[PDB]
From a paper:
Overall, nine variants (T256M, R296H, L303I, S313F, V329M, S331L, E352K, A427T, and V499I) were considered likely to be benign. In addition to the five variants that we predicted initially to be benign (T293K, T353I, K398R, A445V and K500R), our study reveals seven more (T256M, R296H, L303I, V329M, S331L, E352K and V499I) that are indistinguishable from WT OLF across multiple assays. Thus, our data indicate these should also be considered benign.
Myocilin has no known function, and there is no glaucoma phenotype in Myoc knockout mice or in individuals with a homozygous N-terminal truncation mutation or hemizygous deletion of MYOC, but rare non-synonymous coding mutations lead to toxic intracellular sequestration of misfolded myocilin.
Numbering used by the authors: 244 to 502
The structure:
Amino acid sequence: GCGELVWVGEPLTLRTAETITGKYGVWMRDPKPTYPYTQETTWRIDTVGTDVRQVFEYDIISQFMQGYPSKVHILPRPLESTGAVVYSGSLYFQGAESRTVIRYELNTETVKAEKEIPGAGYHGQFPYSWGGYTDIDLAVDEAGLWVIYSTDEAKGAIVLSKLNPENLELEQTWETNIRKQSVANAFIICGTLYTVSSYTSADATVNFAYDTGTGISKTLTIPFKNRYKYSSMIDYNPLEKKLFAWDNLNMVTYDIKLS
Ligand SMILES: [Ca+2]
Ligand code: NA
């Protein structure tokens, strides 16, 4: 059941990092789970620092919320920032100090594909408003895998491209009029890109939308609360139909409603 985003619920805290290494990070589930994982499997990456390689994996939700990881993967190359996603058995992440997206198959711990995002800024050229080298933000929605970025040709406006999940080729590209560094983060629901106005405010909003199906841009005023005042990661999971976010040590989730 697709539709336009009309409401975001209150953030629910599922886990809190215990060290500064997890001030920012990304946590995620696979909306297209594949053996040996399930819809309960959760991954967590604490992303502070310069040689981020540890990916914590939890087989079931209770372990993610209360226990130790069931497995730790050591990535073969350091990861950049908070934009990564898991999709159909692979972690898609950006190589540190690069515009390269890497497909890392989790079960086999194998790199299956790598792609430079053509023309994408990286390492602080088109971050979201908080910085954090957030130039490249992967996304999964009801239609599959996407990447959110910008380029010099787009003058820093958000660009989004649909990606082939097997080989990382770009399938189609859209250019918005939204300055990427003017918004706190972004995510895609049902082919519409949404942005969040602030990473600090308890009274932020989902403030812009761009519908890739119609080409129409809109302003919105949907309330969005940063409970802990520093949201470094905001993504959408189309299986759960929820937002997943990382806010100042806290892994949080928001319910949503679509028209
Ligand atoms: Ca995002
Ligand atoms: Na992302």
